[PDB]
């Protein structure tokens, strides 16, 4: 194939995305959930890991590592410690709200995903870490989990397959950094959500110091359908090495902001127009797009004309797919202010553990505040660029990179606006 998009309803995975069908077990089963789960479990961990590998699935939490290889780090003999699956439902990236829909409208897909993914890893239980603000969603998930326990689908002799598997829901207490996989683990252990250095890796020393895999809600919830319909069915969608379907959040200056499921590698322009109703005020009113959550650099309208929505295409555009949260800014936007607010966000979310982000992001925030008003000199633009490069790659976790990239995107594509703002300020004062 060379064109991707126009995914048909029969090929969509999250068929209750909009919550217009019963989200409880009866509704879930009528839609295909929990079907031949026992046969999947008995096929074995090696078979399950092969199916996820052939599917070409990559992490949906923002980083996009190959899921099959990542989950294979667990496929190792016991050494006395329990093994755990940790499901990342922190869902904290600004612009991103996809995992919210899965948890509250398709909870049984997530619950089955834990069991199947748990089996492939040899894990005895799954801890689903969900952000504290999602109280109603977590309560929905607990109800679905109880239905699974009562029906014998999870717990002792899960699905009548002889495999014991528990599913626990743990709520966060308000911290974006707890979406980071090691910070998430530290939070479950009752500590401050501060990421660990690696090594060790979670597959060796994880939650409670035991082998762990942290997987995104969307990554886990699509696994049972991949095993049922085959890896090759999943790989038939999207470009090579960009396989599958994807949940997209289109927000910002669009006519109909929404969440939708679409094929990977769909053109960005097609995604905004077909599903979101187009850019507010017409396509030509577009200014810039943040293609995959606040941590990915913005791209200008010129780049947005032809760019595809997948990992490799967006990396080539000097950005990233991230969480596939598309934030649209039209030409009425104060682009400098919009980015400055994201830096203010990262400043509020930095855990403060390590020097370059604890001090650097706050420093970038102060400089961006002045850049919004023009209260700076042009020579400070290159200084701000250099500061961002001293944070990126020098911190414990990727939040430091996530704060540096938005600044770099602004300077790369909108330097004249920054300089014009400074000229206006100097003339006035």
């Amino acid at each position: 194939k060379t064109s991707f998009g126009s995914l048909k309803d029969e090929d969509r995975i999250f068929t209750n995305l909009y919550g217009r069908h019963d989200w409880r077990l009866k509704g879930a089963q009528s839609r295909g959930d929990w079907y031949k789960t026992k046969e999947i479990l008995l096929k074995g961990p090696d078979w399950i890991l092969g199916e996820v590998k052939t599917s070409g699935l990559r992490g949906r939490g923002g980083a996009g590592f190959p899921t099959g290889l990542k989950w294979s780090f667990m496929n190792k003999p016991s050494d006395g410690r329990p093994k755990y699956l940790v499901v990342n439902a922190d869902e904290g990236e600004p612009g991103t709200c996809k995992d919210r829909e899965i948890i509250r409208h398709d909870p049984h897909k997530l619950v089955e995903g834990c069991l199947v993914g748990g089996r492939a890893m040899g894990a005895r239980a799954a801890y689903i870490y969900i952000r504290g603000e999602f109280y109603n969603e977590a309560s929905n998930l607990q109800v679905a989990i109880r239905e699974a326990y009562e029906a014998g689908l999870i717990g002792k002799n899960a699905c009548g397959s002889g495999y014991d598997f528990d599913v626990f829901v743990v709520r966060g207490a308000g911290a974006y950094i707890c979406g980071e996989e090691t910070a998430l683990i530290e939070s479950i252990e009752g500590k401050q959500g501060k990421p660990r250095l690696k090594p060790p890796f979670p597959a060796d020393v994880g939650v409670f110091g035991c082998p762990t895999t942290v997987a995104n809600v969307e990554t886990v919830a699509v696994s049972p359908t991949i095993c049922r319909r085959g890896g090759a069915w999943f790989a038939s969608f999207g470009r090579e090495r960009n396989s599958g379907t994807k949940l997209f959040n289109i927000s910002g200056h669009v006519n109909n902001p929404c969440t939708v499921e679409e094929e990977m590698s769909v053109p960005l322009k097609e995604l905004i127009e077909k599903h979101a109703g187009g850019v507010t005020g017409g396509w030509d009113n577009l200014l810039a797009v943040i293609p995959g959550g606040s941590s990915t650099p913005l791209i200008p309208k010129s780049v947005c004309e032809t760019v595809l929505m997948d990992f490799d295409a967006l990396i080539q555009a000097q950005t990233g797919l991230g969480t596939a949260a598309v934030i649209v800014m039209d030409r009425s936007t104060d682009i400098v202010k919009a980015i400055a607010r994201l830096i203010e966000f990262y400043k509020h979310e930095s855990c403060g553990q390590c020097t370059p982000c604890r001090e650097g992001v706050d420093w970038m925030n102060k400089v961006m505040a002045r850049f919004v008003r023009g209260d700076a000199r042009p020579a400070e633009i290159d200084s701000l660029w250099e500061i961002s490069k001293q944070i990126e790659g020098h911190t414990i976790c990727a939040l430091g990179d996530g704060a540096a990239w938005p600044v770099q995107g602004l300077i790369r594509h909108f330097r004249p606006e920054l300089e014009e703002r400074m000229q206006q300020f100097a003339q006035q004062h």
Binding site: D9, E10, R12, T15, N16, Y18, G19, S30, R31, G32, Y35, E39, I40, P82, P94, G95, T96, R100, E101, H105, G132, E133, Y135, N136, F168, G172, A173, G174, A175, I188, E189, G190, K191, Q192, F208, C227, R228, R229, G230, W233, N249, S251, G252, H253, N256, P257, C258, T259, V260, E262, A276, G277, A325, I327, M329, T333, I339, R341, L342, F345
Partner: protein, 212 residues
């Protein structure tokens, strides 16, 4: 402030205990984790104290440290690290307006301005009647329904200045307004009609691979 100073209203001798029914909940909370790792229950138990009491006096933090046999400092760290814990009393309704860029782009400033004008307070303040507290928060994970607010445990979404004033009017009367979007749509589906998932979903076994 992230330091504590004893006052008559907030000191170690302030009375806090879990109700007998909350001790049963704590027992089930603690059992979710391996034996020897009871410290894992600090966040859910600390959150439970906030639900019984509304906020966390230093005495509530000390009680949680006692129950789980962790040093009090390790509970103080958790209480001050996570933003959902209230270390000062809040109003009966905690209004949390999202002002991160996606909500900013869709005019969360108008929502924030409307609340202040109606309640006659500023960001961070509590009404004199102690019914409402107003603060700004970061992305609440409901970006496609911007602008939006969280009030206690509920999201109110797709808001306009008029809509948020009617929610506050209901809260003042003591009634509970239903959560969710206020623009017509039910959740995250595009307004003006579904662009997908219009067909009925396929049933069990559809497209299942052979041999399974």
């Amino acid at each position: 402030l992230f330091v504590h100073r004893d006052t008559p209203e907030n000191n170690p001798e302030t009375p806090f205990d879990f109700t007998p029914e909350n001790y049963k909940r704590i027992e089930a909370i603690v059992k979710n984790y391996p034996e020897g790792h009871k410290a894992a229950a600090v966040l859910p138990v600390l959150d439970l104290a906030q639900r019984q009491n509304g906020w966390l006096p230093i005495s509530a933090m000390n009680k949680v440290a006692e129950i789980l046999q962790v040093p009090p400092m390790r509970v103080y760290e958790v209480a001050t690290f996570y933003t959902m814990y209230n270390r000062k009393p809040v109003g009966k309704y905690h209004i949390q307006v999202c002002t991160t860029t996606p909500c900013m782009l869709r005019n969360s400033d108008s929502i924030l301005e409307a609340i202040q004008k109606k309640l006659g307070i500023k960001v961070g303040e509590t009404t004199p009647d102690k019914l409402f507290t107003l603060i700004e928060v970061e992305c609440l994970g409901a970006c496609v329904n911007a602008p939006m607010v969280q009030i206690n445990d509920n999201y109110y979404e797709d808001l306009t200045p008029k809509d948020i004033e009617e929610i506050i009017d209901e809260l003042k009367a003591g009634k509970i307004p239903k959560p969710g979007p206020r623009s017509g749509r039910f959740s995250c589906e595009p307004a003006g009609g579904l662009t997908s998932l219009t067909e009925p979903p396929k049933g069990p076994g559809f497209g299942v691979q052979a041999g399974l």
